[PDB]
Design a binder for this molecule. Structure first.
Ligand SMILES: [Zn+2]
Ligand SMILES: [Zn+2]
Lengths: 137, 572, 570, 131
């Protein structure tokens, strides 16, 4: 565990550190209406791309990672959302998808999938829960 | 030499969050127009982007929201159409042009107000599919006017003062320096003397300012038409700032562009499909599945969930036991359940029997029980069969019908992997015990006493059945409510344990018999060998059924004395 | 020693509710419909002056099961669709028109001149039924009567006539031939012999059934020239008698509408509502199920204290759902749920009050509604309310303050509080409040394969002393079922008076704590003392609370150290 | 008791006119099949006092149904109670569901070797009602 205000400070620092902005995977990096969350829009790694073609037979447009704080568990919670690359009239379309097997799609919330649960706390958390299974830089 | 024609990068890179479309569906239920507001972060821009991301959410529909300190508020609007064809048929070049005229009419009054964005959209609420196209009015007056520039490194000293000035005034897109050499708000009389202009840039590309620069320069040519040569500063919050010696040249008329190109680099609308949110069945199924998986990966890695999910379970009886067992079964991920009961729902039934309501009285129990399972979890494969199970030690009321029921019961026992005898009394247990023994199926027995219960399993040295060896299982017996819950949970826990490789499993012990008691709150676990003279298991009884078929059953039911003879229990 | 002949009413009607249920059934299908009733003239109740005419659902069946000596009387029923019509019909005219059909058929066959008719109105909204029986008795001519004097010398013919009517059940009359044998009615043979017998439906002494009017009327049509004859009234009892008869003075007089209980001429009314009241039926059978546990098994078991116990449930989750189900089974009529949640799509599979279609609805209000859906008479209320966790900073101070006040109001007004919540830290605030308000408390806590059940009510509370009672814990399905029922069984056992000198009650042992385990299938029982240093118990904490109120609550929640220091635990 | 042994004793019991010679019975009848005996009885004076003391209502009559329970292979006595009221000033009978049935003495209340049926009658019927 770790206090809400300690996490609020470290999130803004990590955000302003541009460590996510300098990431090759990130299309966009943004805080929510509050400063208490961080939404990461990411370019799919090659391995994820290979898996969605193998497992789901579909093409992946991008994934969304949301770093949130649960005031219940007093810990960070990582929400995930997966989008499909598609088309309609010849116009490329993007579609939020609900994978048959999302465990195997990678190598391992209300509308979201979710991962389950000292000054360096958040920066280290990202290393294990994010930077481990996705390449950096 | 060392002079160029100034080029321009696209002003913005649009990302529309799913919550933005939610709010779009919500407002359509609460063509037209409506204001939008987005906060630009110009200090932190992803390296993969040539311009600042334009990010709109549900909160973008509210004119005043909470921006961070150095962020820049950007005013825009959205135009929603009620017909897909109206969206396609819109002249885009004409639409964006008359947005530019609105930016121009604003720009002459206040130069900082000539910048905005626009979204056109069509929301298909049936399919939950969304069509959007962003555009950023950019105008050149005159269209024939280009800008010749060359580097001016001596002015690099002004970069810091403009960064801080733009940070503080977040509503301001442009500043100039006055006669006192200080950064001030744009004034047409002042710029005329000093001839130095600073613009807030949204582009990260070196020496390529955002196309928005066209807007400001178009107003600069209207305000001070005689200014051919000035100094242009393009201010960025990174090391990418640059200064230019600028000249307006020729090669009124207003050119307009700025429709955003798609992921393919073509001028087309984007399309977002949210339809997967309309499938809660799939959402539920995955939710329930992952919850089960947590029992494996987090706690007991060797646990087999798949053998449980694949198990076909026959429930004999729809009573209190049948209702609680089934509920605990679906919780373990068992998807196939057949109820067998001859009853009809009583008005008083629902209170002890967990699958039924008061409004359900008068309906057949077996079907309704199954129907209720699908009401809890619609993906459940659940059926029920109205069937009588003949009591041993009684004459047959209908020989013909009970013969048919006998055949159907055996067929059902062949069809299922696990059998639960949930029946009312001992007298109803004999026939299914025999049939399951012949078909060699795994059986769980649950019997209720007033304060006590018995849960046991028929085997596949042998364990032996229910009949092998005081108010328990009496059929006139009214039982304390807690007993059935206790019995049912242990019945299922014994089952899932049994499906695991062993004499203990990953889930713990797998006893032959479990007897609990309420009065001392105790539980006993006892074993027992298959009895030689039992009128269920005994090879003489098995021999008897195989040869004589239904004729043996009819006789053993109506004359249990005859059954003791065959079993050799008579001599005992 | 001669007299004029009087008559008793032909029949006495009794209509079983099956007849009205069957009459109802046909009002939803498609004039008069045929009825068939078997008369037992061998056994007639002493209370009755005539053979009972008994109607059921099977009276609509044209051919039904008869006993051997019984007589299949035929009739019809006229069902009007409006009550007003039933009233306004002329009874005196209607029964006359039926008699004409009886008179008509009587000339063809003298045995077909006896029948009955039921006029009716079925009100299906109130399930109320109006019926009137009548027997078309006709005296033709109206002026012609019968003078009779007894002739006991004919008593030898009684047995011959008794056994004759027994054999032929479709025949109402018989005569003698020249050989003095019993045969069927024939106009030829009767003029010579002048001996006629009638099967009698009356038990009234020397007073034959009014049906006799019909037979004497047909006799005068067939044999107009017979003034004097002998009449045998034949009964299967000892009360048969012979009569020497004479006719003494066209127009037909028709009587025989059945009188009611008060002897007035008026329809009968049956009220079958209360078959329309399943709420009361269900209520009575349910309680009667409960009473069976008392009289048959445990005579001194007290039901009323359990029925009158007001129960507060904190949390609507798996435990709350099953606990309430075990409570309504025990006869508890008042349950109040408290939950801050909303039903998820996944919820119904482990939470026994909800269905898939119920996702998106508030749990508390819905759990209570679900109880009313099971058993419509329940005092059941949901309350959407948050319980503050200790060791966390308050999310909304003003809001949780209101919810704090609302929780105490709820605890005080309820008799027994169950703590069903998700976590250990969520138990503290209710444990403190329930301590202050002197309420009996049962806890239930779930671990992976283990469960905990204990009573606060010196014994001391939950806080008085690995996956157990944690926010993230996923449990085996069986654990919650086990803990829920043991909680309720402990609660019912707790409301019973303790036997003299021992701890036990009529329902058995009342342990302090129960801790179960799934892997080894075993139950542990432990008894713990109350502690002077407990955070939810200690008089130091109780007097701190009484003095500082919500401010003591707010600080203890956010800084447990402050609470531990007050209680002297640190 | 066997079914057919009960079927014979029911017909003997009926034919003995024992119920027909009772003062209470308005009517005695066997059902469509011979499996049962419906007794329509006049309320005893003691019952009339009771229902008026407790339910504050007038009793019309009592229906007892003598049936064979094929579950327990034993006799089962069913009970229906009727109330006296009026509508227009004429008598109306109404099937009632007593708020307390136990202290008063298919919707029916139910009671919870060759001489078998005659004994069982004396115990389960003639005892409380009286002969
Ligand atoms: Zn055996
Ligand atoms: Zn304590």
């Amino acid at each position: 565990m770790i206090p809400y205000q300690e996490w609020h400070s470290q999130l803004q620092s990590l955000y302003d550190s541009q460590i996510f902005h300098n990431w090759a995977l990130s299309q966009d990096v943004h805080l929510n209406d509050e400063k208490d969350g961080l939404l990461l829009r990411l370019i799919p790694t090659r391995q994820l791309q290979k898996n969605t073609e193998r497992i789901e037979n579909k093409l992946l447009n991008h994934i969304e990672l949301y770093l949130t704080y649960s005031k219940v568990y007093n810990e960070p919670l990582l929400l995930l959302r997966i989008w499909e690359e598609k088309s309609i009239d010849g116009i490329p379309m993007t579609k939020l998808m609900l994978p048959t097997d999302i465990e195997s799609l990678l190598d391992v919330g209300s509308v979201w999938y979710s991962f389950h649960p000292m000054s360096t706390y958040l920066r280290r958390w990202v290393s294990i829960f994010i930077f481990s299974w996705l390449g950096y830089e | 030499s060392s002079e160029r024609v100034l080029s321009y990068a696209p002003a913005f890179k649009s990302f529309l969050d799913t919550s933005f479309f939610q709010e779009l569906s919500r407002l359509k239920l609460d063509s037209t127009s409506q204001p939008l507001t987005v906060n630009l972060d110009l200090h932190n821009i992803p390296k993969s982007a040539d311009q600042v991301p334009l990010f709109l959410t549900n909160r973008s529909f509210e004119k005043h929201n909470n921006k961070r300190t150095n962020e820049v508020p950007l005013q825009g609007s959205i135009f929603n159409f009620n017909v897909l064809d109206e969206f396609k048929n819109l002249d885009k070049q004409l639409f964006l042009h008359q947005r530019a005229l609105e930016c121009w009419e604003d720009g002459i009054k206040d130069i900082n107000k000539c910048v905005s964005f626009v979204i056109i959209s069509f929301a298909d609420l049936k399919k939950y599919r969304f069509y959007y196209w962003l555009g950023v009015p950019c105008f050149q007056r005159p269209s024939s006017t280009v800008l010749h520039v060359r580097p001016e490194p001596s002015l690099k000293g002004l970069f810091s003062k403009c960064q801080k000035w733009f940070d503080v005034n977040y509503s301001k897109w442009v500043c100039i320096l006055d006669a006192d050499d200080e950064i001030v708000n744009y004034d047409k009389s002042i710029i005329r003397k000093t001839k130095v202009l600073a613009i807030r840039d949204t582009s990260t590309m070196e020496n390529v300012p955002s196309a928005l620069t066209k807007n400001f320069l178009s107003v600069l040519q209207y305000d001070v038409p005689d200014l051919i040569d000035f100094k242009l500063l393009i201010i960025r919050q990174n090391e990418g700032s640059f200064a230019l010696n600028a000249t307006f040249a020729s090669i009124p008329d207003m050119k307009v562009s700025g429709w955003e190109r798609n992921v393919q680099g073509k001028l087309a609308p984007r399309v977002v499909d949210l339809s997967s949110l309309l499938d809660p069945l799939k959402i539920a199924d995955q939710s329930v599945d992952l919850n089960l998986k947590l029992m494996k990966w987090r706690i007991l890695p060797d646990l087999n969930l798949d053998i449980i999910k694949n198990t076909k379970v026959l429930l004999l009886g729809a009573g209190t036991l049948g209702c609680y067992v089934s509920r605990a079964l679906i919780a373990w991920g068992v998807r196939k359940i057949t109820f067998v009961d001859n009853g009809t729902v009583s008005y008083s039934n629902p209170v002890r029997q967990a699958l039924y309501n008061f409004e359900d009285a008068g309906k057949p129990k077996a079907e309704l029980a199954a129907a209720s399972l699908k009401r809890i979890f619609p993906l459940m494969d659940a059926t029920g069969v109205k069937l009588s199970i003949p009591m041993i030690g009684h004459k047959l009321v209908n020989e013909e019908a009970q013969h048919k029921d006998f055949d159907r019961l055996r067929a059902l026992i062949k069809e299922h992997d696990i059998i639960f005898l949930l029946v009312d009394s001992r007298e109803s247990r004999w026939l299914p015990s025999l049939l399951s023994n012949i078909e060699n199926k795994t059986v769980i027995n649950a019997a209720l006493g007033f304060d006590s219960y018995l849960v046991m399993r028929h085997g596949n040295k042998q364990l032996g059945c229910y009949f092998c060896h005081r108010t328990l299982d009496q059929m006139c017996t009214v039982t304390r409510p807690g007993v059935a819950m206790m019995a049912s949970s242990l019945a299922v826990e014994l089952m899932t344990s049994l499906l695991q490789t062993k004499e203990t499993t990953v889930l713990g012990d797998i006893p032959h018999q479990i007897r609990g008691f309420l009065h001392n709150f105790s539980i006993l676990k006892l074993e027992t060998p298959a009895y030689e003279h039992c009128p269920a298991c005994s090879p003489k009884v098995i021999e008897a059924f195989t040869d004589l078929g239904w004729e043996f059953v009819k006789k053993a039911l109506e004359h249990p004395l005859y059954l003791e003879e065959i079993s050799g229990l008579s001599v005992i």
